[PDB]
Design a protein around this ligand. Structure first.
Ligand SMILES: [Mg+2]
Ligand SMILES: [Mg+2]
Ligand SMILES: [Mg+2]
Ligand SMILES: [Mg+2]
Ligand SMILES: [Mg+2]
Ligand SMILES: [Mg+2]
Ligand SMILES: [Mg+2]
Ligand SMILES: [Mg+2]
Ligand SMILES: [Mg+2]
Ligand SMILES: [Mg+2]
Ligand SMILES: [Mg+2]
Ligand SMILES: [Mg+2]
Ligand SMILES: [Mg+2]
Ligand SMILES: [Mg+2]
Ligand SMILES: [Mg+2]
Ligand SMILES: [Mg+2]
Ligand SMILES: [Mg+2]
Ligand SMILES: [Mg+2]
Ligand SMILES: [Zn+2]
Lengths: 78, 116, 136, 51, 60, 177
RNA sequence: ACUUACCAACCCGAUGCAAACUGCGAAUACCGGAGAAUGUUAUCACGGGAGACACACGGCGGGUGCUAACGUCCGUCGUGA
RNA sequence: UCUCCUCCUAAAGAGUAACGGAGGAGCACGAAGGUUGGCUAAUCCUGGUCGGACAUCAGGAGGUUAGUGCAAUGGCAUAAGCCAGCUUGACUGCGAGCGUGACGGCGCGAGCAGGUGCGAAAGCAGGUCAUAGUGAUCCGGUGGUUCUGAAUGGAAGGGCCA
RNA sequence: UGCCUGGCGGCCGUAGCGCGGUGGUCCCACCUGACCCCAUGCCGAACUCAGAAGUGAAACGCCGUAGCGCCGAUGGUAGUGUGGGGUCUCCCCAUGCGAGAGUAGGGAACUGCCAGGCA
RNA sequence: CCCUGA
RNA sequence: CGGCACGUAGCGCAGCGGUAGCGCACCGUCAUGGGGUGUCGGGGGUCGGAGGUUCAAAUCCUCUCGUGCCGACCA
């Protein structure tokens, strides 16, 4: 008896890193994700693996917006 | 449909200018008239406006739907913007090809003093 | 012997059988055999019960089978050490929760329906009752 | 695999080279590109050369 | 229309034997002499039995 | 231009009287005429496709688009992106001049002509027909042909229904049987 | 052109099932902030010294096994150690 | 079977095991990268020369059921999908801050200096829709740099950069 | 200040579809010509330019109507944290949270800035 | 190379 | 029970992203008064069954049914 299975990949540690209402510095990663599950709002940038990073100081603010009801992340300036 | 195709073309540039927070000189064009609005970074408050349907330009203009009309509208909206003291706007063509009447308006505003 | 024509996957987890059932009303016909106990119904068991019903009624009336054995069950052969891969699929079961109308019947008088459902309940491994269609 | 390494060496004689890969069978002609040479600190033409 | 890629397309005269003279732009170059047109085709104009033949061949 | 003037002066009046319309814009127009050739043996000889392109160009007075495969097909051994046809689109003045050429010259020259089918409308008012031998067009000289070819003609019309489309073509005196 | 010992796709109405289905969606858990009381700083950093890296059973959530084993492998809690 | 990627198990943050259930990788591409401009799918029905169940054409229905260089997941209409013009940012030195590992390491990154490409401009560009496509150290090979050079001047050799 | 129209937004289906009607002084759209500025891997179809004879046919906007889409209680149910219990594969009790679907119903959007026409 | 029995 | 090798015309075998071929056999005509040999010339295959990827499967992948080969050892 022998199995054709048995392989898995090491987990990439995705998810929301800093949650809503948390105060961040400039350049802090907010989420890591595969594709724009969350989109970048004000003062948030999208790096090439679609990583949303805080472009300025302030507090993280999750919201929904737009005609497709897509989830945006903003940084409200302190 | 022409209007929906044009709005689909314009959406990318408008959303980029919204992200950058720029004061927009938006131009609208019809077969008979041509319209220009300088609009605030929040996108809801129109700072200044000038168009060929106004009598103050349409009296001097021969026909309202040509490049001379576009140049007159561009000079008009530029002088109102400089009177109100903006001096720095970004052009929003709204999906019309930057050519012909839209180019004439943008050039007229650029010579008259708006910076883009 | 009921079995899906094809499935996305050949093997499934064991899972659990909690909760009470949906599809608890007599929907198409007039009488129903409803399961009160909890368990699994093998395709062989379903087939034996259906055969007993149809032979008891002598092919008048109409019989609906309201369950389908869509979950595959594996087994290991004898003299095989524990742990070398999931075993091979042997049979298919339908998980049953209480109140689940297993079989259902129309076109026959009530006493003959009760007798047929009694024979099939004798072939089934779980506790059943006889129910009648109610207006709401 | 079949893609093999090449270098793009300077036309300014500074000795500076980038290294890339190339598919020789489909694209046998030589590669030249205008890229930045940090020795002279200007963009100049890099031409293909062997490793 | 794009320039220099389209064929030469200049007006010629086509004459049909029913006395018809017509002028059309076309690419053939020379004049045209037509056997039939829309004014003399029998379909356009409108130009398009056993017991009978038995009686005709065996009248009594 | 001849049949276009004929349209403007009498066909719109005829259709107004026939259908009790309210608008001359509601009175149907002939929108375009599209000529197509399926030259699928280009896979064996691509040069014959260039011959068919020259053929269609000479017929329509216009350089044709070389149309390629939308998706690959197993039975006909064609790949996606491979050129298998040609097409011209006629609008405006050239459309009217070609339409006059067709209905006056080329249609009476058809071998064994008994009329065109009145069932050839696509349910929306648009007409389609086929030409079996391009030699019916006088632009193609006889002894310069290499292979007998055909084409098909689609008159696309802004009419809403089959009755309206066939009424428009009958008002242009299109030889229906 | 007809008949069905017959077989049936789409759609419509009614009924179920899914770890690798989701237009819905909790309880908990986790992250951040504010506030009171309580706790021998219970927290973090740095330095000296280790041991340990063979776990067991019980409850809950599961894979596997036969929803077999005082079986086996995980998560979390408790006790023994 | 041994390294790497995707889903589930995995108990709604992260992580999580078995000779648990299913699939992939050991590349490709100077355009399949950059930017500017433009465009929207699958399938079916109707009509049409060869032409047929299926080629190219026209119209309608439909609405992403398509597509993505290659698995699966998560994304995508402002398209990240498709067509064209000009191109080399597939740049050099750095980098606030952050994520992820016991460590070795790995990833994201606004912004600053020099020089460039596309754009009328705002701008965008430090490779590709993202996640696989890999290999420490030693010992050596080639190009640049006197940084060193066993009395001194060189050189060999060593260092530093590629 | 009222009505109609155009542009840019807020919010993102109570806001979208369908069906019926209606509007052209202005505005908008179709429209009329194209050797030109510019354009089609063919075509002034589209993009563009110069215009204003016609029509609101299509489109668009507005109005009305539930055939749908959509929103949606109260009560009950399922689940579940903590403590306890049973006949322990599964449930029950005390207590805290409490859906999904369905039902009564709601429902033919609301609103800001600028400009134009009429009153 | 072969030639069914009388 | 584990692998691993093949199923292709009536028979025996090659072919393992596009064509399906070879020898014997069968058939038609010659040669012989007749048969065999021999000469001229035809035709024959769901590629074991079935389904997944793909422009397209005898071929790549998987399940399944036969046959054959090699191991089911230490206690
Ligand atoms: Mg251990
Ligand atoms: Mg343990
Ligand atoms: Mg144990
Ligand atoms: Mg998790
Ligand atoms: Mg959890
Ligand atoms: Mg652990
Ligand atoms: Mg790409
Ligand atoms: Mg673009
Ligand atoms: Mg791209
Ligand atoms: Mg990729
Ligand atoms: Mg020395
Ligand atoms: Mg010395
Ligand atoms: Mg050296
Ligand atoms: Mg026009
Ligand atoms: Mg109307
Ligand atoms: Mg509810
Ligand atoms: Mg409505
Ligand atoms: Mg013998
Ligand atoms: Zn004639």
């Amino acid at each position: 008896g022998s199995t054709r299975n048995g392989r898995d990949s090491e987990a990439k540690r995705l998810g929301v890193k800093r949650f809503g209402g948390e105060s961040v510095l400039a350049g802090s990663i907010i989420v890591r994700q595969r594709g724009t599950k969350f989109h970048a709002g004000a003062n948030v940038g999208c790096g090439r693996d679609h990583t949303l990073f805080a472009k300025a100081d302030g507090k993280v603010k999750f919201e929904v917006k737009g005609p497709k009801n897509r989830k945006f992340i903003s940084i409200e300036a302190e | 449909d022409k209007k929906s195709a044009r709005i689909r073309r314009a959406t990318r540039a408008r959303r980029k200018l919204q992200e950058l927070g720029a004061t927009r000189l938006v131009v609208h064009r019809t077969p008979r008239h041509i319209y220009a609005q300088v609009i605030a970074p929040n996108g809801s408050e129109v700072l200044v406006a000038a168009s060929t349907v106004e009598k103050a330009i349409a009296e001097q203009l021969k026909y309202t739907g040509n490049k001379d009309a576009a140049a007159a509208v561009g000079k008009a909206v530029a002088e109102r913007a400089l009177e109100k003291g903006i001096k720095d706007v970004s052009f929003d063509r709204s999906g019309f090809q930057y050519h012909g009447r839209v180019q004439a308006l943008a050039d007229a505003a650029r010579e008259a003093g708006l910076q883009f | 012997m009921l079995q899906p024509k094809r499935t996305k996957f050949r093997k499934m987890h064991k899972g659990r059988n909690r909760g009470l059932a949906q599809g608890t009303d007599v929907s198409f016909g007039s009488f129903g055999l409803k399961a009160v106990g909890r368990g699994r119904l093998t395709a062989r068991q379903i087939e034996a019960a259906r055969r007993a019903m149809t032979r008891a009624v002598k092919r008048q009336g109409k019989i609906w089978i309201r369950v389908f054995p869509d979950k595959p069950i594996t087994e290991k052969p004898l003299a095989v050490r524990m742990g070398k891969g999931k075993g091979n699929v042997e049979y298919w079961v339908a998980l049953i929760q209480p109140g689940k109308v297993l079989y259902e019947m129309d076109g026959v008088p009530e006493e003959l329906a009760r007798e047929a459902f009694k024979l099939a309940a004798a072939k089934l491994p779980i506790k059943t009752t006889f129910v009648t269609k109610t207006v709401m | 695999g079949i893609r093999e390494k090449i270098k793009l060496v300077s036309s300014a004689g500074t000795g500076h080279f980038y290294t890339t890969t190339k598919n020789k069978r489909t694209k046998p002609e030589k590669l030249e590109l205008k890229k930045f040479d940090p020795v002279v600190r200007q963009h100049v033409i890099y031409k293909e050369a062997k490793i | 229309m794009k320039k220099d890629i389209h064929p030469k397309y200049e007006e010629i005269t086509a004459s049909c034997s029913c006395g018809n003279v017509m002028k059309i732009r076309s690419t053939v170059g020379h004049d045209l002499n037509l056997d039939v047109c829309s004014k003399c085709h029998p379909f356009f104009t409108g130009k398009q039995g056993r017991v009978d033949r038995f009686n005709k061949r065996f009248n009594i | 231009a001849k049949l276009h003037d004929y349209y403007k002066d009498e066909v719109v009046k005829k259709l107004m009287t026939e259908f009790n319309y309210n608008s001359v814009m509601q009175v149907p127009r002939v929108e375009k005429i599209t000529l197509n050739m399926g030259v699928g043996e280009a896979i064996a000889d691509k040069k014959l496709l260039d011959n068919a392109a020259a053929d269609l160009a000479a017929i329509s007075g216009q350089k044709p688009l070389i149309t390629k495969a939308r998706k690959s097909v197993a039975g006909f051994k064609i790949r996606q992106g491979y050129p298998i046809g040609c097409k011209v689109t006629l609008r405006g003045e050239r459309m009217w001049e070609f339409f006059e050429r067709l209905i006056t010259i080329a249609v009476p020259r058809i071998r064994d002509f008994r009329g065109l089918s009145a069932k050839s409308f696509d349910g929306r008012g648009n007409y389609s027909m086929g030409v079996r031998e391009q030699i019916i067009f006088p632009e193609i000289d006889y002894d310069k042909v290499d292979r007998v070819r055909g084409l098909d003609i689609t008159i696309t019309t802004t009419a809403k229904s089959d009755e309206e489309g066939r009424a428009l073509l009958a008002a242009f005196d299109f030889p229906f049987r």
